Design a protein around this ligand. Sequence first.
Ligand SMILES: Cc1ncc(-c2ccn3ncc(-c4ccc5c(c4)[C@](C)(Cc4ccccc4)C(=O)N5)c3n2)cn1
Lengths: 933, 163
Amino acid sequence: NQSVVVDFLLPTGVYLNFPVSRNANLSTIKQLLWHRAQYEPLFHMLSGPEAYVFTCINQTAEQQELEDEQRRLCDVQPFLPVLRLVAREGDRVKKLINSQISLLIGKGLHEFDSLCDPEVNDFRAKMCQFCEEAAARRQQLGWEAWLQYSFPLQLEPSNRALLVNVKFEGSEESFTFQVSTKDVPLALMACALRKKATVRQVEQPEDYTLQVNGRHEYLYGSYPLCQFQYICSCLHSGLTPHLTMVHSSSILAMRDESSVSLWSLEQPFRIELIQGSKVNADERMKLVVQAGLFHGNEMLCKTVSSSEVSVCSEPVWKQRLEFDINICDLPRMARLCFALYAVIEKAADCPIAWANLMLFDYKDQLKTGERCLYMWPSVPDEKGELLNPTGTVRSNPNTDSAAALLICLPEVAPHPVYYPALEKILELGRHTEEEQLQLREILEGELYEHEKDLVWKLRHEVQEHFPEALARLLLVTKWNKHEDVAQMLYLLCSWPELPVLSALELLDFSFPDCHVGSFAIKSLRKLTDDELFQYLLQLVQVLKYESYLDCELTKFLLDRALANRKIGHFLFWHLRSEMHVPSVALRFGLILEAYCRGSTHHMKVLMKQGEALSKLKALNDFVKLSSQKTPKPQTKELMHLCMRQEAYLEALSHLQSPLDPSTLLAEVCVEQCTFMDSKMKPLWIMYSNEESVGIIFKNGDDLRQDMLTLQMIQLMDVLWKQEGLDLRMTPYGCLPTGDRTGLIEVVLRSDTIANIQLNNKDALLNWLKSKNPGEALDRAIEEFTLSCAGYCVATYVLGIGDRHSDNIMIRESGQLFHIDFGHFLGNFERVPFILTYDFVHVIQQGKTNNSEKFERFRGYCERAYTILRRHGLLFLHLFALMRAAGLPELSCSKDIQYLKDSLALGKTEEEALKHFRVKFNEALRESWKTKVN
Amino acid sequence: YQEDNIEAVGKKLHEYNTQFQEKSREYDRLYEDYTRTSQEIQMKRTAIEAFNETIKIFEEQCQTQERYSKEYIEKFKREGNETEIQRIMHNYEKLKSRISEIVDSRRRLEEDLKKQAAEYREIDKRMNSIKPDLIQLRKTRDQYLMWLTQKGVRQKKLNEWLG
Ligand SMILES: Cc1ncc(-c2ccn3ncc(-c4ccc5c(c4)[C@](C)(Cc4ccccc4)C(=O)N5)c3n2)cn1
């Protein structure tokens, strides 16, 4: 029903209880309260209704002061319907933001306090401070700088006439006039300003900016007009650009809307395994604890095992486990890793659970005393290693029910001991042609033991002559010897800056040392915002390999998120979409908090999106439930009735799209909304604004795989466009937003091949003719040809099988594109290069043998392939970092090896191209045979 | 120093692959329950915190009622307005019984969390009993596959047996 019984606690102590509408706003509820409170004791001592604010307990178990009284009660979602009147006064800005952050990040800020963790407290204090300072500094900037922050230029990767429709703000009168394609925006502004003058006549051209009508996209800066994506899109399609002149003030309106060294301790490292807790194992078996010390993926010494005790819930050991390494030789990122095993009594071992521990803390102190390591359960995978050194050093947050190991790190000295400061490391770190020839060939494939000892000897030569081989030298360094670690880090500090490509490799789990990650980030600061955005997904995933909360990578990502609002938008959603994953909830939540505090403007946009997304979840749940009961037309009508409810419609309308924050999702076209017939019943939601745009909301599948694939295809598109090859790709938006939840951009004016063929027929070629009659058909065929080649090469390189008429689409322009990339890297053997007969036929213009056109198509495929090979190491490094994501189809070196083989990186370019040619020709032969069946 | 016909070993490869796929699907189902239950236990635990914070607000209201009302109970006693005293105190009694309803709701949820905590532990126990069979079946499947590869059995024949 509509009404709900709400408890009201007055500041006099008086208590009222009465029904109010779930749709009623808090301002209306306060009026109903005041009218009822006058007939209750002690009314006269109350101040007026505007002197008080309602407080509730919200869904994240925190108190919230309800400052916005235009909010409906059903939107506020109080845990229990209990509203308390309290005094407004106090720091209401900080109170409001603190409460909004909790709801937005999906995790109450109180949960960070409840941990009683200094690392956490130091992170929040330092990062929130830094983010606020940037936010305040940003506010003091001019209108141009703020425009660059909030609406960065959308430029093509990168002379004829072009007429543009220019309009002014708050005026339906518009001006159409000719402009050169290579004109700067400022020249177009000066033109429209003169025509506005030629009517009272005066304003300057510098005070204006240009906006794309019905979008938050802006044309400014020194670039020519055709380099802007909107104009480039307009020039190609043939539509005339529709721009609005916007004043400086209008942009400002938006803005204001002690005496003991570590090296002295020569005793061996050891631990006390005390007790296990809440173990769930087979009672017939026995329990064992494997322990080992690691640096990255390398063992520092041999793995020592506990004794066998009987299986119970609360096993006891009380053993001094000693390791084959001194305390003086432990590196900064030395990692104690445990695995609990249930074993059959000696007279297939079960990996139960695992847990890792940094031996040094976030302030560089070697840890002493007891620890309670709450364990993660072991998943049986193909490479069944004894331990899990790559796994997170953070504890399982399910402290209520998860298994635990209690250990004790002993006292090494009377006073605390720190890992030596940089100055002491560099102090200890200082100090033939045959072996020079041996080094050359070794660096021109991970090194064998005999090769490692040569590279180490000639490490000074590697710095001087082979600076790009830093990664190789770091792997050969003996991280279980402090003398060697000191020497390697001495070289590292003076090491020359490396290209972006090399820096990306150094972010991987093999290079855990803080100085290495710091050197990596230093090399990544070169990155433009456009390039960074291409790697953003990967840079976020490598946060899962970090040991401490306060790290260089987090600082870098926040830095860039605070300087560029588009980067901050997608950083937010990449972190937010993983808040349900307990291993990252804490780390990601802390980054989101700091981000939010430096980004109050975008907080408001993200809030609107989160509420839209929460309504879509409930709308989709209703549709799943309804679809299994009734036929589709009735479910569709029931979907629309649920949508037209005030709270639904308002929450679903007038938001910036999560897929692209410059796109406005204005009015919901409820009659055009529907859902798709696949298993999860994804919702198809249409919007209208000012020149139609659509989104698919999908709940039930993890869309990260699809996002990765589409980002790679987009990167391909960029790399091709950078060499002057536009293969006319449709890398449509895909964005994970939550737990098995995300959005997919709708491509309008497109259909599936199956639908077109369903209606040896010319069905595909006639559909193109019907959509591109007369002179426009040649363009359409050329668009098909270019896009067919791009997607043929893309799908082959990424190993995307299961390609059929249902998941390949065509735009009315002719552009062909693929959808639904649930499988890649040969999953469903090597996926062969594939040509479809029906596509060859469209490429040949409906003729049997059109060698001129076919050879051009072959050329495009071959050039496309050749360009990707030149950037092969970029794809390998990016995929290597994506192994942190934990995608089932990207878990191991075999998955990476798939990409090496498909790009033929072990071959010369000539060799690669000759093999590709054979594969191409063989695909043409196969194309004939497939359709005859 | 340093055991069957090919068709017989291939039949056993097919059987062990079929047993491995089934045991994997059993484990994947359990891991899904494990994942779902861990999320649900977390939600209940924050719900208990929310009850705690709600009960806390109500106890502040009781504290407030007791300090604040005193002067007005004494003032209305001098003026003979004992009915107004009776209204204040009856209103406070209604507050108190509302606190008992909320405490009872918190208790129901603590007992549900208790049951689901035991379910979590039973799910983990079943997972840990499945793992030996799952791992053993993977290793056995791989050994049969290597034996056949050594014997020179073609990839197309191996594919028929592997599902
Ligand atoms: C995992 C995953 N990834 C990507 C996409 C995905 C991404 C973008 N786009 N852009 C259009 C479609 C699209 C797909 C299928 C169909 C259609 C359109 C029509 C032509 C129209 C229709 C829509 C809804 C209900 C009924 C009819 C049809 O008949 N089938 C699409 N899909 C989907 N799913």
